[PDB]
Structure 1
Amino acid sequence: MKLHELKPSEGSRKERNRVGRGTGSGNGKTSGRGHKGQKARSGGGVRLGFEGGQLPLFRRIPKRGFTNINRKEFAIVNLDVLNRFEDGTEVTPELLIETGIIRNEKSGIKILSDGNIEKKLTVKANKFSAAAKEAIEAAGGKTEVI
C-alpha cells in the first residue's frame, strides 16, 4: 500500500470546527452564542420540553389505554416468499427458521395473503388469514394448523 502514500476516500473525512480562535474565522469573541442571554451561559438552556412557564403540550391532553400482559404477537410471512419452494414439499415452521425467512419465532407463524402464489404447496403453521387460506387452496395445496 506504500504507507507513505495513503489517501483516504474523498469526502469521508472532514475537519473539526474550533470556535473562539480570533475574529477572522467568523466564530471568535462570542463563539456563535449571541449576546448576554440564558442560552449564552455555560451549561445554559432549558429542559427538552420546557416552554418558559406556559403549560407543556403533554400536560393538556389526556392519557389513554392500558397494556395487556398476555399480548400475543405472531411472526408474519407473506405469500411471495413462498415461491422459493418447489411444488410438492410440506412447509413447516421448523423448516422456515433455517432458510432465513424467520429470524425469531415470537409467538407463532401466521401467513398473510399479500402478493400471490403460483406453486402447489402444502404448509403447516399456527395461524392463517381468511384470504391466505383460500389462495393456497386454489393452488391445489392443503392447510393444516399445528
Structure 2
Amino acid sequence: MKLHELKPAEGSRKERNRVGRGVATGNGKTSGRGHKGQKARSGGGVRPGFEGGQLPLFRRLPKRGFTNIN
C-alpha cells in the first residue's frame, strides 16, 4: 500500500449495473415490456385479486420472560 498503488481486496467491489445506456449492454427497454414496467410501477405491495395474506387470527400477550443460562 503505497497510495499510488492501492489495491482493493480481491472479490470485494464490482461495478454497478447501468441500465438504459445502449443496447449491446443488454439493457435498453431497460427491463420489462409493455406492461406495468411503467415508472409508477406499483405491483401492489404483495397481492393478486384474492387476498391470501389473510385467513383468520389468533392472539394475546401479557408481561413476562426470563434470560437463559444453560
TM superposition score category, shorter chain reference: 0.7 to 0.9
> Where in structure 2 are there 5+ consecutive unaligned residues?
none
How far the C-alpha of 1:45 sits from its partner, in A, is 2.8
The alignment-based identity, stated in percent, is: 40
State the aligned residue count. 70
CA distance in 2, matches of 1:36, 1:74: 56
Instruction: Report the aligned-residue RMSD.
Output: 1.3
- Where in structure 2 are the equivalents of 1:114-125 lying within 5 Å? none
| Greater fraction of residues in strand | 1
Aligned residue in 1 for 2:65: 73
1:47 to 31, 44, 48: 44
After TM superposition, what 4+ stretches of structure 1 lie above 4 angstroms from structure 2? Answer: none
Cα distance in 2, alignment partners of residues 20 and 73 from structure 1: 54
Which amino acid counterpart does residue 66 of structure 2 have in structure 1? Answer: F
User: RCO greater where, 1 or 2, for CA within 8 Å and sep 6 or more?
Assistant: 1
The one-character-per-residue Cα deviations of 1:60-103 (angstroms, maximum 9, x if unpaired) are: x11112112xx22111100xxxxxxxxxxxxxxxxxxxxxxxxx
Q: Which has the higher helix share?
A: 1
Which has the larger Rg? Answer: 1
Q: Could you tell me the TM-score, scaled by structure 2's length?
A: 0.85
